[PDB]
Amino acid sequence: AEGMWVPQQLPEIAGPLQKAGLKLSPEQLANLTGDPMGAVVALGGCTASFVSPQGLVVTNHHCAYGAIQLNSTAQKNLIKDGFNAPTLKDELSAGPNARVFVLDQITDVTAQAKAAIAGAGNDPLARSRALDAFDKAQVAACEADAGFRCRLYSFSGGNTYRLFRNMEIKDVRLVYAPPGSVGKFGGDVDNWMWPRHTGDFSFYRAYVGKDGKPAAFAADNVPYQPKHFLKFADQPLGADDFVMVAGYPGRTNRYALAGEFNETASFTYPTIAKHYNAVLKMIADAGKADADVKVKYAATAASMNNVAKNYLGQLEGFKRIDAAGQKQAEEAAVLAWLKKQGAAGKPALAAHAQLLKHLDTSKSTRERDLFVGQFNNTSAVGAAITLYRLSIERSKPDAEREAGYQERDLTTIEGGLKQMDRRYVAKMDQQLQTYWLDQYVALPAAQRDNEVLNKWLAGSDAAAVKSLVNKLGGTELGSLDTRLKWFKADRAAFEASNDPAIQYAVAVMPALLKQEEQKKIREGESLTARPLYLQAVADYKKSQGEFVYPDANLSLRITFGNVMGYGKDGVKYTPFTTLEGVAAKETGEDPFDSPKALLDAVKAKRYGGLEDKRLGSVPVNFLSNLDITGGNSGSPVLDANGKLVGLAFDGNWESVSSNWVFDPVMTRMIAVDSRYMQWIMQEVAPAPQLLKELNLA
Amino acid sequence: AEGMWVPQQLPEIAGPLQKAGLKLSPEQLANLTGDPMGAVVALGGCTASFVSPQGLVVTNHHCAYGAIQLNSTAQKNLIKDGFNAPTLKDELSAGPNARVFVLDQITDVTAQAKAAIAGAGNDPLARSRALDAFDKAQVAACEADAGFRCRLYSFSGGNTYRLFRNMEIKDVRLVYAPPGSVGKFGGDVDNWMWPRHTGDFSFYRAYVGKDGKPAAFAADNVPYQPKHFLKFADQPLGADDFVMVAGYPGRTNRYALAGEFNETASFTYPTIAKHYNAVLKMIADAGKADADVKVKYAATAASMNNVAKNYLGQLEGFKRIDAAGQKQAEEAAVLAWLKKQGAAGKPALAAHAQLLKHLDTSKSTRERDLFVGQFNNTSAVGAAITLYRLSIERSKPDAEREAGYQERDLTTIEGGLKQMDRRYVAKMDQQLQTYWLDQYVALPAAQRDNEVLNKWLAGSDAAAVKSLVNKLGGTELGSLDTRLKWFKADRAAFEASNDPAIQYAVAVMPALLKQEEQKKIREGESLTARPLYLQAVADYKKSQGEFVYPDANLSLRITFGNVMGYGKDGVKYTPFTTLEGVAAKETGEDPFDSPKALLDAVKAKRYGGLEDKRLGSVPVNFLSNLDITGGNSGSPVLDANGKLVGLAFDGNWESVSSNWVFDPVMTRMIAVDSRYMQWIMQEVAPAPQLLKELNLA
């Protein structure tokens, strides 16, 4: 079924849920801290779920990838080898910034948020500061009890605001990862593709301090005891079976203006894909010369591969469904429908005209902004900018500090500085600085108008770039101890440093704060125009009997449907893959290089009690017509009785353009079957302690 | 069904043919100059069929591609535009070397063939001279009537010889070609692939002189009046329908030794694919800089792309089916079964040992012979060699001249010199000479032992090469009038020439005739062993219950089966594509750039009365489990009642390795539906005169 339904829309999908095959009462799904919705957790960018009473959490391999990479070395490469912890004491810290968010409360605060915005009058910067202040005040009251973290969410262009309260677990440990050749079978070749044969799962465990409250990693921390956890399905999942997903989709753009779509299609997507593909070649080459580079950059290389391929898929999809035609026609129908409404429709029409004006702002600054943006986000420079920015915010009262630099963010900033030790090599950073500066100096002189960067380059050719990278090479911010000292330093110490990375951050900061102020002005203008126009689009959609649900915004959503394949001319994709399809793809070369114990077990038909007689094998991956996006990775797929039948991890090639224009015919979720996850842990990469904990052995 | 069945085997398949759903009688098929089989003709490298009483011939577009190519200029490009001849006199010569072969009779001359070989004795060279003389003599007699061509075919390794007698139609004209965006929709991207949407068809007309004997092109030749022509099906072809193909498959290698397969898989296919891919990049780069280069090298680039992609598919297929293992296990089972046959086993056991020592002769000289072979076959140099060779052979009497340089070959040689005019650009041929010499001068010193070439290079780097290409550019053989002068010149005029390409021909010819003697010796030693070992395999296969049929050898074969898809893990390929599939593949960029009139008709559901209700659209291509190969292109696909339901044109990706090891699971023919052919000639690139002549209007 189409839709990323908010829990508050359960009454509207209760009948469709039952019709599709839900055997739980839709009522049971509305208790978001009960069984089973209470077992679903956010990781920050991925979904996961509790699967034991001792705080075992299951998610995708690609969601645990960062944690696995932080614990990998060139010599002991867990990404390649996998990992198992036989006992609690063998579990590895997932890193200081790993989180498990357990939902405690959702509050509707729409009327209060709208009153705070209106309270600001017709000044856009005051409107942006009013919502900021409201957001900070809600979050401070909601976080007064130790161990909670809150977040204010804007829905439907700012027509609805809800405050989420979560227990924030800060001690997350790695328990199990299959080998990379299972976890990421087919690599970037099979990424965004069906047929699919990827065992995309791993396990964490949540820990708390001995006092029961969240704590950073410590030896005497103990496993979290969740109130609810999911059970692995005892009923074999088959074609046409009801499935549903609860998770944290990040961002969809189905309500974007035609011009926002056109800009993304004609500039953002092709341009990011081009540059990311070129940076990836550079990282791949450096990785072949030094395995330390390969391991330290593995998470970046993985994310950049995923985005670049997703973008190429979205562009193909737009042509497939004529997304440009469909956006143009819908926007024309909404503006014509408003007109026929007379008086009542003039506000939305004026809100449209205003958003329409916001587009053109980036035309001959978009290339510059990209290159300067990427240069400033390289590791040493970005660390210098964050550290200098924090030194400025610390001089203010906490309620006046920029979101991201308040007291409640300090441990996350510090964790980032710590995680950079596992993700930084000077010789690779210099190549990244060189790459983005090179693109900058190749712009026409009109567009290369970053005056600070112009001063530090003192040229617009290869030698000027080499000279600046040589200069920035003298930085000490590669040192973890140096970064942790700067983390506590006052503004004056930054301003006195002869560290060239720090000098660069001090020099660019005034222009950065002015660019941020301009952003907040544009935000404040949108805080009134966006909701008016998006409410009209939603009203129009309801007039046309179309499904109305908010764009994803990193909050909890439910999607449902059935196990089913899809088709193109000449082809029908079947809803399951099987073990034989894994062995049929074997080449012995990355990324089609399965463990020997897998190839041996498939050749012997060792199905380990998990064969589905309807398939004649153990199922590997399955297709369903659910509505997921980035952020849904690791979401539990629940059957009609709320049991775990698999994890969401990807979509088929034709699904990716549904970020902009949903296509029900060729949009499918790809999930890993809970039976394959059990089969891998039995036959290939043994986890006997985990199968016991899951009551599967 | 497996098998390229010779017409004599009709008894054995009579029943399976009927089980499959054949509604005509097998006796009807044994009538080879009758209906329907008498409609089926050979083009030499392609199959075709009579489809009107006025000599109308249908074949594939890629079979007609050379003809279309010859009639194309950078200005008037019929590859891109297509072609239609509304009247007889608008029909374009398909070229001097274009033929239609109509089968007159098959006689077995095995005994006399085995006599000729025996009655030479031991001396390998005498054995091959003997077979050549018996071949020349049997042909000279069979061709005594003015308008016939005869060919001696060796089957099952030389266990069976047959003389084929054909009426040779020498005046073939192009009537109709769709646009290249239809004829070759999907280009080298969709080549060897399903799903497929290619309207791979074109029409020729067979002309003879007013006397009724075949003749070369002349203004007052009239159309041939075939005894038999096929009718286009009125019964709609659907899934599971019986289909059969008659045609001229070129070469299969299912009876090759495990060692011949190992050489092809380990050296020949990888090497050819690599060097062809690099030459194709060059021709693509040159054609983009010069539209005259693009058109003149279109046919060469098309053939090299087809071969390169085919080989990559064969290598991939070998790994899918473990061809290496199956060939080793068969070569080991045959020897074990012969060593249990006692006295009856020993002649085949000795024949194997004799053949097993023709393998270790190449490892050192294979790269050299490839690179020198390719260089010698560039256009100016290749013309120079052939023309000088003919002058050598002219001075001998006819029956002692090399096969291909006889009186009966003069027209084909002269045709080749004329065709070169539309296939030669000096700067491209120099790029080709450069590529291949460059590969030669890259070889280790020990392998670089072509005396004349080392002499002419005087060095072993890019500069020495450029020096020789510079020398050779001085040729006048780029001129057609020059090539026709040399065609009628004697040995001494060649040996007096200061033309550097003629000078190269004369200089290399001694080493060439030496190498050709050591080749005929090679052939001689094999001519008795090969028969004996291949009969043992046939007997072993017959003993195991496995189908026995000879490897393709360019003679007439029948294959049969049913319209059916295939699958692999997670995917079922359905047996038909449809119009909507063509439209869905549209990018507006070559090779997915359909005529506007196609895209307009698809949108508008103008099905032209050609809807299949079961598909809900007009079908485009279909799949079936027939056994075809190179040569079978343009073969009529006949339904249960011997009516034309389409043309064979390609095979799916997994089919191509069946040239060495047949696989019934994933081997399918791809054919163009006769309703797509009509629909194109009605709705898209009209041919109202053809529809009339075919009785479809």
Ligand SMILES: N[C@@H](Cc1ccccc1)C(=O)N[C@@H](Cc1ccc(O)cc1)C(=O)O
């Ligand atoms: N494409 C996946 C990540 C991946 C990379 C390589 C190998 C295996 C997986 C991905 O981006 N998944 C999303 C979830 C998602 C996104 C869009 C969609 O249509 C369906 C699923 C994620 O990581 O959250």
Ligand SMILES: N[C@@H](Cc1ccccc1)C(=O)N[C@@H](Cc1ccc(O)cc1)C(=O)O
């Ligand atoms: N691959 C085709 C030629 C072609 C190229 C590009 C577009 C369309 C057609 C080809 O080689 N066809 C063969 C017939 C054939 C060969 C092998 C096989 O398994 C099935 C059919 C031919 O030209 O005769």
